[PDB]
Amino acid sequence: SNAMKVKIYTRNGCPYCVWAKQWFEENNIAFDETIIDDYAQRSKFYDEMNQSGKVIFPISTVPQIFIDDEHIGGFTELKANADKILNKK
């Protein structure tokens, strides 16, 4: 509504996903997580996404974060934009 549309793509056994997730969690920001376990499947996804132009740099890992349909990026991108974002609530 007045909330942020947060979309996060993840996989298992990735520390950086967990770390990302919990930044939202401890900041009380609800998000839609999509997990993609299979390597092969993630690969197909990077390919699709990269060709779509929804993304501001070519992705080849997770996490990937989108807020309000803007590619943010990975955790290091998140931490970089931590303020822009928190001042969006």
Resolution (A): 2.8
- How far is Cα 78 from Cα 51, in angstroms, rounded to an integer? 23
- CB burial of 15-33 (b: ≥16 within 10 Å; e: otherwise) equals ebbeebbebbeeeebebee
Q: Is 69 annotated as a binding residue?
A: yes
Q: Please state the length of the chain.
A: 89
| Tokens coding 57 | 């740099």
- Cβ-contact 9, 63 below 8 angstroms: yes
Q: Which fold has domain 1-89?
A: Glutaredoxin (3.40.30)
End-to-end CA distance of the chain: 11
Q: Which residue has the tokens 């060709």?
A: 51
Q: How was this structure determined?
A: X-ray
